[PDB]
Amino acid sequence: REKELERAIQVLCRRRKNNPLLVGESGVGKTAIAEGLAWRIVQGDVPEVMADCTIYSLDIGSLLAGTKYRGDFEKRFKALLKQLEQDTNSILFIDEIHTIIGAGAASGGQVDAANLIKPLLSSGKIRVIGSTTYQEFSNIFEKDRALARRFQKIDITEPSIEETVQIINGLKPKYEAHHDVRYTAKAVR
Amino acid sequence: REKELERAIQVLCRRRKNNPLLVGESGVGKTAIAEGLAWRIVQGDVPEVMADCTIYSLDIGSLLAGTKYRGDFEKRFKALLKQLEQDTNSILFIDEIHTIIGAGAASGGQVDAANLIKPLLSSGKIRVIGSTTYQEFSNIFEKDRALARRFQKIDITEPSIEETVQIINGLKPKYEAHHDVRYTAKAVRAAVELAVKYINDRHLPDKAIDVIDEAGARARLMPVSKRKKTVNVADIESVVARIARIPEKSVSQSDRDTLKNLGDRLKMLVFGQDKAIEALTEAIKMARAGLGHEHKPVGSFLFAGPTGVGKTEVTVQLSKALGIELLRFDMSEYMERHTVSRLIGAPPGYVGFDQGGLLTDAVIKHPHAVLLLDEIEKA
Amino acid sequence: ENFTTNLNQLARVGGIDPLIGREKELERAIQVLCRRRKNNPLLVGESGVGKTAIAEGLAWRIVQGDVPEVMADCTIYSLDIGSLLAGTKYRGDFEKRFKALLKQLEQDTNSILFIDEIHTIIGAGAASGGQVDAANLIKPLLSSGKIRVIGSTTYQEFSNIFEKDRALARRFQKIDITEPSIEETVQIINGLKPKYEAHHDVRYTAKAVRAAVELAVKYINDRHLPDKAIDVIDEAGARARLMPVSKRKKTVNVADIESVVARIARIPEKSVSQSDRDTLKNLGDRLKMLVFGQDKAIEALTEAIKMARAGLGHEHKPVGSFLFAGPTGVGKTEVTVQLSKALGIELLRFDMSEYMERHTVSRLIGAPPGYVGFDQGGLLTDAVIKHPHAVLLLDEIEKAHPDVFNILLQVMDNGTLTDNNGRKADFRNVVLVMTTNAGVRETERKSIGLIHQDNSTDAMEEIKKIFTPEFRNRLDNIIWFDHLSTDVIHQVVDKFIVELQVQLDQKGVSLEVSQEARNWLAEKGYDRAMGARPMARVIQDNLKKPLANELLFGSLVDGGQVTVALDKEKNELTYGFQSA
Amino acid sequence: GKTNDWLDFDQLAEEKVRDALKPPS
């Protein structure tokens, strides 16, 4: 996934709207791309500009837990963007970006994560990594034309047979250690 | 944006309901005119009626951070309105103004930012600038007639191709300093011209600026010194092809040999039918050469013949030779007239509105692909 | 203490606009206030009609002394819920202040309270485990007729919110504040002139005031009469104030009013500028250089657009509603696209072949309330509202269900269309052009007889059988596109060659074709029954195909020049690949 | 022949609520 990561890094260096959006089918590795950039950074296989940067995985449940009182969600979410803005070396990764459309809306509550992150992406102060499926990108994410304009769609294609066998070999050590068995090379093919 | 800006000034100098609302599609530049109204004021290229005026952008999220207590939101919101009214010179720019229609409503009460501000707007003591998309304004803002009546809608349309080139020219120093690159005049023109032709899901000012910012980052990443510090036209073409998921304008050396031997490779797999192979290869060659149809597919052929002569096989083998997806659509299932819904989805308000059209979704997912409609006559 | 504002004091310092007219509505409110029980007047009406004006005009009149002596010198208190609810975090704080104000009101016994947008008091102070809300607190006092209050709610906010609470609704008297007449609005603006005149330091003429109310009513249809006329007058004053950059200050005439009304309604400005006048002058000639032949179609379009700009348009109908019929390959859908380009207006293209199902109408105007697609809205209605000045192209209209032709009826007869959200779409400035292929089989088919016949009439009868008489009686014209002539084909061939040269210029390649070779291409590809489309296939096989093999692998990889000439002995084109 | 019926799909409105509390003392 050299080309996908390369385009993602190119987008993350943009002056404005530096928010790569990983769109693909179900099974294709989208979260891995966002969650693999972290592994690449610690190992050192990343450009100098993308070095010394930490990727933060945002969970919606934890953010919307115990926020019945008015303004509890806004406080938590604004504090996150504040701490993330003063860092300048942090990238927020949302596994399901389609879920911020109605995260905080209570009753005609257009004030939500979707309408609150817009001034931040347009100003190019933070970097956000997204991930969503085609079935949910077109029918939920694409409906908010403003939010979809701040995210640069990065289509992910199903790897070929030759590409997939290399992936299996890279994951073989962890899988071999769990089951305590050794998979033959012929078996992977 | 002199015409659009002038209208905003006229509304601001009104006696009552002096709130210029800025409606437009996403990316047209609604927020640019609001934030830009302050940039002009510092330089001084504005009338003296608005000179010395201040603008304050409102952050609805921060205002609702600590308002859990009863009458906590109203207190701070009313304080801001008092400051604006007593200042008599500042302006409140509420971006995404469609969000104040339910702000600070905890219980089933209709007391919100919109109701609170409504009397002040009707008196003209404060001046407010809004910004809302067409869908948002028509679906959320315009539903409140009282609040809509206090704002003067100012529709702004995307600029002309020539006009957007000047916008990028003015923004060149900012983007050039960030990426430490220089943009050629031809590059800016190509970005505008090529983005309009291929990118059809965004607007001209924003999409054109997206090609210029993406290309600048690519150049910086490249380690070669000669390409770095400069952005040629070829760089812009590659970036546009990437965003649109279409073949690059300039044919790669790898693809130049594939097209040359595409006919021979197909002939070995499927013998005879030289006319069919020639038509497909020639059409593809014209499309990659760039002298293709301005707004029509690479080719729209109708294979007719006996059974087992190679009609389906040649099409199936063309995708493998070019390494592209094959959109196989069996038309026998579309014998009935009502089956058309499957291709383009059901209309709004029906059970299948969410599913969408199979053909449209498949094509969008795989724009560069071979679409095979087998047994179309049966449909 | 600081929650209610004395409107009498505000009215005495000149801070309340004067109330002109509305004597009938004023007396009804006053009569209600003089009752024994249920003496609370509730002014209900649309937004912009003047509800708040009447509630504030009462105090203005009381100061002047023109009201009946039954309630002379009464003090009207305007309650702002924002100040009352603010700073009531502690338990019982909102009830202490709210009950304090009511206690003061009863002690006076000669004061009336005015609550603008009174629907908001339902749940104003309520909270989890809430002790009481503002609505319940006032219920005792209202039932016992102790204190008289004045409410103001819109019709939308009087059913979903106020009608629900029958208890409070019973203690109020609904008053339908209908919008005034066109004549009554003129009087209202005459009395209000000094205030606006002093602010902008401008003077409005008598004709200008009348023209505003008249032009606003027939162009602005998203606002009420006492709200849009004042906007035209107010906006005209600010333009007049800022216009004297060189001290060119004069009286505000009717011309200034027309200009502001145009921007508000986004209709083309009257008294078209010389720059725009030149565009319409050579619009026909400019179109004739891109679409050859079919002069009757270009003339109808250009003349319709001219009449609408010159003022001699239709009252409430689109600029034009033309049904472009004829054989294939002719400039039916092309002339429409070129028209939008020359005029510089947005082209609204609608492929009517996707509306074959009778229930696809929901996509055009939106799904009704309560359905999944209500939020999406209608494509046609929203597209028109976004671009009121556009060209609406309906291609393959005959390929749609017969029920999609009934929507266009009101679009052509009334110039309006109502979507699911109740919004009105204005088609008065859209150039409606519908292209059809009705009876194309007939034209391709030849008659069974010694003498061949013209099937133009045969295709007209099919149109009559598809479109009902009412649909065909509201179309400005039905234009028939005649087959392309041989002379036209030569012009069409040059047009396609020019397009080829533009594509080559992007690659640094040039091409030159002699008139001898151009004539040869016309004969091979000319087909009267198939129009100009076959000419694009011949060019592809004879010019684009050889060039493509050279561009990818040959002398044109990095630019070049080509010369195309025919060989008379072999009657075949010769391609010369100069290199570069 | 036969008539092809069409089944409309209804949408229901459900909205969350938040509670603004008042300290007792």
Ligand SMILES: Nc1ncnc2c1ncn2[C@@H]1O[C@H](COP(=O)(O)OP(=O)(O)OP(O)(O)=S)[C@@H](O)[C@H]1O
């Ligand atoms: N004349 C202009 N000057 C500067 N920037 C412009 C101009 N026109 C368009 N833009 C673009 O506007 C961007 C800033 O965001 P805007 O386009 O103003 O957002 P917006 O359209 O108000 O957003 P929403 O989401 O639709 S409310 C800039 O980065 C430019 O790409």
Ligand SMILES: Nc1ncnc2c1ncn2[C@@H]1O[C@H](COP(=O)(O)OP(=O)(O)OP(O)(O)=S)[C@@H](O)[C@H]1O
């Ligand atoms: N010209 C050919 N060369 C090689 N194999 C061929 C050729 N024509 C047919 N075949 C073989 O026949 C099968 C392909 O038949 P198809 O091309 O799919 O038939 P078809 O034209 O779709 O038939 P219909 O639907 O009855 S008109 C495969 O098994 C091919 O290997």
Ligand SMILES: Nc1ncnc2c1ncn2[C@@H]1O[C@H](COP(=O)(O)OP(=O)(O)OP(O)(O)=S)[C@@H](O)[C@H]1O
């Ligand atoms: N009869 C009238 N005499 C004088 N001015 C009037 C009259 N009716 C309306 N106006 C003016 O029309 C404008 C709008 O009327 P208002 O009464 O202020 O509206 P409103 O009832 O507050 O509107 P909402 O908030 O949308 S329900 C103001 O400038 C009024 O002073």
Ligand SMILES: Nc1ncnc2c1ncn2[C@@H]1O[C@H](COP(=O)(O)OP(=O)(O)OP(O)(O)=S)[C@@H](O)[C@H]1O
């Ligand atoms: N009179 C003409 N002059 C120049 N080009 C023309 C003319 N008529 C048709 N063309 C070309 O023919 C092609 C098709 O034009 P259209 O306007 O789509 O034809 P049409 O007759 O409306 O098509 P259908 O399929 O019958 S609806 C385009 O490339 C046009 O530029």
Ligand SMILES: [Mg+2]
């Ligand atoms: Mg995932």
Ligand SMILES: [Mg+2]
């Ligand atoms: Mg914006």
Ligand SMILES: [Mg+2]
């Ligand atoms: Mg087949």
Ligand SMILES: [Mg+2]
């Ligand atoms: Mg009012």
Ligand SMILES: [Mg+2]
């Ligand atoms: Mg057509």
